[PDB]
Amino acid sequence: ALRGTVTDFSGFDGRADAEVLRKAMKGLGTDEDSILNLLTARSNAQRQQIAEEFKTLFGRDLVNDMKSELTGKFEKLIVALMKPSRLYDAYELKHALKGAGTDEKVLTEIIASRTPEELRAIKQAYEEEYGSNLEDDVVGDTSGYYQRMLVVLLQANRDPDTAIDDAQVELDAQALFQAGELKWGTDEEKFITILGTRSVSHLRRVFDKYMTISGFQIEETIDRETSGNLENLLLAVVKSIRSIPAYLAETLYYAMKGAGTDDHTLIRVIVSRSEIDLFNIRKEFRKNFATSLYSMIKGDTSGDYKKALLLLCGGEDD
Ligand SMILES: N[C@@H](COP(=O)(O)OC[C@H](O)CO)C(=O)O
Ligand SMILES: [Ca+2]
Ligand SMILES: [Ca+2]
Ligand SMILES: [Ca+2]
Ligand SMILES: [Ca+2]
Ligand SMILES: [Ca+2]
Ligand SMILES: [Ca+2]
Numbered sequence: 001a002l003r004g005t006v007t008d009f010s011g012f013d014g015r016a017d018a019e020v021l022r023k024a025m026k027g028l029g030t031d032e033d034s035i036l037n038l039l040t041a042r043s044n045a046q047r048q049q050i051a052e053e054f055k056t057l058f059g060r061d062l063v064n065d066m067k068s069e070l071t072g073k074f075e076k077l078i079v080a081l082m083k084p085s086r087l088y089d090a091y092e093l094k095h096a097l098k099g100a101g102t103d104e105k106v107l108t109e110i111i112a113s114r115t116p117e118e119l120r121a122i123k124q125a126y127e128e129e130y131g132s133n134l135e136d137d138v139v140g141d142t143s144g145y146y147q148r149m150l151v152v153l154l155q156a157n158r159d160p161d162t163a164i165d166d167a168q169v170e171l172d173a174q175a176l177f178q179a180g181e182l183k184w185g186t187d188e189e190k191f192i193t194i195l196g197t198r199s200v201s202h203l204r205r206v207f208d209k210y211m212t213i214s215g216f217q218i219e220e221t222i223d224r225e226t227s228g229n230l231e232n233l234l235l236a237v238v239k240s241i242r243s244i245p246a247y248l249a250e251t252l253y254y255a256m257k258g259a260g261t262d263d264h265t266l267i268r269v270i271v272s273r274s275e276i277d278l279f280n281i282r283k284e285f286r287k288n289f290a291t292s293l294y295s296m297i298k299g300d301t302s303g304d305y306k307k308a309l310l311l312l313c314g315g316e317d318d
């Protein structure tokens with residue numbers, strides 16, 4: 001069931017494509033159309049093979065020459081597609097923790113929606129690249145319970161999915177109820193432990209049983225009981241337990257639906273998921289917001305940026 005929209009091209013020849021790319025840039029001008037059409041049709045691994053072929057043939061750096069030729073959002077999309085898939089989430093979190101403040105959107109979005117196995121991969125790749133430890137930088141930039149919830153999720157140690165225990169399900173449904181609605185104030189430590197640590201299939205049962213007991217969806221209680229960064233993070237975590245595709249379809253829709261487009265979020269979710277579950281994100285987006293993701297992008301973007309983004313997305317209906 002989980003499926004991306006970008007696959008390995010059959011009859012890939014790294015050497016032929018690097019010559020197509022050399023021609024598409026040599027001279028005054030840039031043929032942005034040959035670049036866009038070739039790269040969105042190659043898998044991320046293929047793009048890496050191309051990049052080293054281009055380097056052995058011409059002794060030139062593929063991504064640096066593209067940076068020289070291109071500009072704007074389209075440059076930013078093409079550079080993102082060229083990041084090895086192993087490094088892109090690490091990349092995006094370093095640049096979120098970068099500068100003075102911190103981009104909590106980015107932190108919350110990746111850390112909530114990535115599985116334990118993707119999170120340990122991202123921590124390794126981050127350390128190797130940036131020479132820093134991820135947990136240490138996250139702690140460095142955040143506070144309060146938002147910080148603690150991010151550190152719990154960064155442990156990547158959520159319980160395995162196993163046979164459900166109903167007595168366990170109702171004990172946790174009830175702890176959450178006494179921890180929030182029935183308390184003056186909130187016991188956020190109790191919400192972080194059960195939401196940060198219980199298995200995904202056990203928590204899908206907990207969220208239904210909590211509805212039976214209180215007449216509220218856990219999302220409704222999180223909005224009632226918390227605010228700010230912790231509220232965003234706790235909602236991202238619940239949404240992701242329910243469906244990662246659905247959560248990312250929803251992230252995509254708000255990056256566009258307002259007046260402008262949050263272009264950074266739109267490039268990050270299309271590129272990071274192109275080879276994982278972007279087909280599923282298309283389905284969820286159509287089913288939920290009545291629009292195809294293609295019409296939504298086609299309406300919200302322009303130029304080569306738009307054309308590239310659309311060959312990457314790929315579906316009408318979805
Ligand atoms: N979640 C917060 C507040 O959640 P409540 O709606 O129960 O808080 C009422 C008021 O703020 C005094 O605590 C806390 O722990 O203080
Ligand atoms: Ca040129
Ligand atoms: Ca041109
Ligand atoms: Ca440039
Ligand atoms: Ca910072
Ligand atoms: Ca901030
Ligand atoms: Ca801090």
Ligand SMILES: [Ca+2]
Nearest residue numbers: 180181183185
């Ligand atoms: Ca309360």
Ligand SMILES: [Ca+2]
Nearest residue numbers: 185186187188
């Ligand atoms: Ca409290």
Ligand SMILES: [Ca+2]
Nearest residue numbers: 223224226227
């Ligand atoms: Ca709130």
Ligand SMILES: [Ca+2]
Nearest residue numbers: 256258259260
């Ligand atoms: Ca818009």
